[PDB]
């Protein structure tokens, strides 16, 4: 009788809703927002924040601060806020009557997991909860089996291999480069047109902007060629207070940087490598069943041409007689929570849960044993 | 200290921040045992 | 119905049917397959160990185990296994109301053939079983009764003459070393040209590349001779990830351990003059017809070369006015089962079964005073 | 001078000098660091790439490369650049007049020996060269002659028996499993304690911890269950930035996989199993010999708790009337090199050196006919 709760906690995004359904209720950004320095609006008699949406709908006068980095839940006060945000505000219940699945990112932090149950049992508390690993929720959402999932967010980029339902964790990789990321590298890249954008406002314009206007070039230095020669790849985009602005090649230089990160500064590989890396950590028996079944997932995989890139890649490193697949569904950007949904539905999964009474008896150590 | 649940700072060096979140872990798992103990 | 089933359990290989018939109903690999990695998606009928076909397919995520090491059962929970998928799932009959014809090495501990006899009895309980040496089988598949078998499987080499039905058991002669060995020596073998087979799963492949590209050579020192000068006996191999392989001389010197078996250190003769001893250790009057009636079975006697260097060797050893005759059919693989359903299906044999009145009598002791 | 010069290339390490001393003369590390960012002053003695000590000590702004792969050599220019600055830069000696005796692993591929050969004949051309096992120089520093040789550098770790003199390749065991997966594996398991090492100059410093903090635990399931009630076994160490860190289990979870080899995903046995394995594959009268001589050598048996974990194992594995004796010398870290200044000294030594005029007439195939 009691409806099972999917909440799924990103760097950047929270999408929490209800088990059993096909999309999220409430989709928001995970962000705090707190009073700014300049005495410039006192008069707000608020408590000591904003979250979500009511931060950046007044975040003019407020500094925004992301609770999530890489991956790691970095303050739990905030955290606590966007929970309660997400609780009470947002999908407008009760949590003492619902359980709830949360979502965790490969190879975290073990305390990350237990504060994780202690805060979910003992200040917001429920009947049960359940923490899940978020590539085998994408591949719960595509549903198959075997298949490689390539899960890239706003705070990490991580591939994880898995063969008839076992994993293999020597083979699971992790890149620290995602959506925050290719922002901050696109707020720097726009100051060479004049555009000066700095504020943590200003953040959120610059990343409208990437999700609006950037793209995936199939060749980097044909498609530079070609924006060098003609005016064809420009776009316009207006701002906030009026103001229109035109860009180019930055529409393709930005995601570019998934491929090459040293235009940021780090020595690592990109994406189709790293995948290409992790293919080869595995056995020899399982790689074919692995080409196949490249799966995307993420909000960071959403770019018009990062399929065909990623397929033109994994081609030219794989040998020539293997078929490379890229599957990548119009609503992967919510695979995870589909996945969530699809797992919390299932009458298998009922006598998996942890009670309040187990929690009690054990501590806040029963969820390595009980939690993949 | 055993006695503060909730301490509310961005932490720069990973050092102290996982110092300050065994701690915290520390004192609510003291809250825990004794909620156990009381139970008769 | 009463028709007799016949079960060959070798060393690698399975082979099954019922008693009558010219060829097996079911050949599959002797392995148990067990889990090694995490497991991550619940429920999907996911099963604790595989056997046969199953655990060959699936072998990427499995460890795989012979129960069977050179023709000795060394795990018998694994081989109630291979037994009960044999009966149910294979050849899909029910135990109870069929006999069964069981195979056996000789110079085997009477401790296997006790334990055989208890399992059939007591837990796959049969009313009559009956265990027979391989090489009798062997010359029973051939049509005659005069000749010396030179049976080689996967784990034993074992030399039987036997002259107008009367076997000679002072002249049988036994071998361990047969086709894991040589897959062993393989993969110690291809790390000369780079190639590294650690894992189970890749001495499956490296048995594939044995059984596909390997042959014996007439000369070998000729032979070695010729694949230093030129190119001409290299050939490629396609791994199941894509790679491609290229072996050469290695083609021929693993089945040359066979002949020499100083190769992987062992201070034993060659498999001609093995055979060659067993001829001059039986009477003088019968050694001509077994000259003429050597008899191959087994599948390690099918590789493409090893007919006519055994006769050359043969006749090398032996005086000048002997006709020496290999006898190597095409079906020489399955002789053994060949010969068990022309066994099983004689009139009178059906006087030669151990019933379970008797086993009750007498324990599981009757298999020595009534089988060879 | 005619002074032989003896000249270790492992995995990690180069330990070079000249033959009848007790140490090498130069111990520098084995990498090639190449710079990764963009150079604006001019001159000031920039170069192109960096090799040995230099390349360490500049390592925030290089990427550092390592030549040898699991005791095979990848990259030959990078090898070239090794050579000339152990011969000019580190030994100050002109290769044109000094012999060289040079090491290699067991089960290594034949090109590589090959190309070693061509690379010292026709570029750094000496009078001579050889290339021995390392296993055996192991027991030459050891002064004994029968033994058992456990060798584990950064790249392999190898079991060579040898008894009065004769070595037993069939039995000679090995395994890629040494001190870089080890590293790799502290690199994995210090991002539980929110840790993020990622760039290969980052690599080293996990290394070093490795190196000062890092130790094998007599029982590990009581040292876990003791780490995880109280932390006094929690340790501090000192980042260059000056962060301060604190591990606990990580000490000894790290070296645990050479024990056990599944923390990783591989599917082998631990360095005890594979050293009571090799001992098993051995004569039976020579068993007891070897079972009291077992020699230790190399970097990755430093840490200080091997010998009484690997007695205990062993003598678990052995029969209970046998004396397990280890022997772990306070110098076995440059046994190679003391054994190859041993072997390069003898009188009985100077004939089997490959000169110039047999390399000449039979080319660069002799290293085969002539070493081991
Ligand atoms: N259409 C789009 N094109 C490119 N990037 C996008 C698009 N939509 C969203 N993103 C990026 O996806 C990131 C978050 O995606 P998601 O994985 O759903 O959230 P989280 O990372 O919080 O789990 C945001 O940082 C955003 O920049
Ligand atoms: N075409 C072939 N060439 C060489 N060897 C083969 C070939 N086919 C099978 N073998 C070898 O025969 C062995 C098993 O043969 P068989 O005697 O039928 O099974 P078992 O030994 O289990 O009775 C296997 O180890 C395999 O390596
Ligand atoms: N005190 C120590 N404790 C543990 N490991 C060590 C210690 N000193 C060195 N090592 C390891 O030994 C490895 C190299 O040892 P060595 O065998 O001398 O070099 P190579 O493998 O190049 O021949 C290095 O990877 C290093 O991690
Ligand atoms: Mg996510
Ligand atoms: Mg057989
Ligand atoms: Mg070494």
């Given at each position: 009788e009691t409806?099972?709760?999917?909440?799924?906690?990103?760097?950047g995004l929270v999408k929490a809703?209800?088990?059993?359904?096909?999309?999220?209720?409430?989709?928001?950004?995970?962000?705090?927002?707190?009073?700014?320095?300049?005495?410039?609006?006192?008069?707000?008699?608020?408590?000591?924040?904003?979250?979500?949406?009511?931060?950046?709908?007044?975040?003019?006068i407020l500094?925004?601060?992301?609770?999530?980095?890489?991956?790691?839940?970095?303050?739990?006060?905030?955290?606590?806020?966007?929970?309660?945000?997400?609780?009470?505000?947002?999908?407008?219940?009760?949590?003492?009557?619902?359980?709830?699945?949360?979502?965790?990112?490969?190879?975290?932090?073990?305390?990350?997991?237990?504060?994780?149950?202690?805060?979910?049992?003992?200040?917001?508390?429920?009947?049960?909860?359940?923490?899940?690993i978020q590539?085998?929720?994408?591949?719960?959402?595509?549903?198959?089996?075997?298949?490689?999932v390539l899960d890239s967010g706003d705070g990490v980029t991580h591939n994880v291999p898995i063969y008839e339902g076992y994993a293999l964790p020597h083979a699971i990789m992790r890149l620290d480069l995602a959506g925050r990321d290719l922002t901050?590298?696109?707020?720097?890249?726009?100051?060479?047109?004049?555009?000066?954008?700095?504020?943590?406002?200003?953040?959120?314009?610059?990343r409208d902007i990437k999700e609006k206007l950037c793209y995936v070039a199939l060749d980097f230095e044909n498609e530079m060629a070609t924006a060098a020669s003609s005016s064809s790849l420009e776009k316009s985009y207006e701002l906030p207070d009026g103001q229109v602005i035109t860009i180019g090649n930055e529409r393709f230089r930005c995601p570019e940087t998934l491929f090459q990160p040293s235009f940021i500064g780090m020595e690592s590989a990109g994406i189709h490598e790293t995948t290409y890396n992790s293919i080869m950590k595995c056995d020899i028996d399982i790689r074919k069943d692995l080409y196949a079944n490249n799966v995307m997932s993420g909000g960071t995989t959403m770019y018009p041409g990062?399929?065909?890139?990623?397929?033109?890649e994994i081609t030219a490193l794989a040998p020539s007689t293997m078929k490379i697949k890229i599957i990548a569904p119009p609503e992967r950007k919510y695979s995870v929570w589909i996945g969530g949904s699809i797992l919390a539905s299932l009458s298998t999964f009922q006598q998996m849960w942890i009670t309040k009474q187990e929690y009690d008896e054990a501590g806040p150590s029963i969820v390595h044993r009980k939690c993949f | 200290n055993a006695t503060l649940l909730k301490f509310g700072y961005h932490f720069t060096q990973?050092?102290?921040?996982?110092?300050?979140?065994?701690?915290?872990?520390?004192?609510?798992?003291?809250?825990?045992?004794?909620?156990?103990?009381?139970?008769?």
């Open positions: 409806t099972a709760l999917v909440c799924d906690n990103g760097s809703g209800f088990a059993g359904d096909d999309a999220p209720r409430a989709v928001f950004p995970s962000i705090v927002g707190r009073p700014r320095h300049q005495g410039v609006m006192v008069g707000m008699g608020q408590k000591d924040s904003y979250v979500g949406d009511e931060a950046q709908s007044k975040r003019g500094t925004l601060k992301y609770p999530i980095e890489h991956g790691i839940i970095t303050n739990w006060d905030d955290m606590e806020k966007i929970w309660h945000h997400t609780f009470y505000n947002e999908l407008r219940v009760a949590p003492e009557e619902h359980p709830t699945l949360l979502t965790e990112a490969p190879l975290n932090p073990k305390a990350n997991r237990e504060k994780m149950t202690q805060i979910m049992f003992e200040t917001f508390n429920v009947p049960a909860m359940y923490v899940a590539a085998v929720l994408s591949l719960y959402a595509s549903g198959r089996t075997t298949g490689i901050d590298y696109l707020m720097k890249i726009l100051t060479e047109r004049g555009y000066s954008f700095v504020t943590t406002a200003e953040r959120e314009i610059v990062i399929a065909d890139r990623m397929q033109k | 990973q050092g102290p921040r996982l110092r300050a979140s065994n701690a915290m872990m520390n004192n609510n798992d003291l809250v825990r045992k004794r909620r156990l103990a009381d139970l008769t």
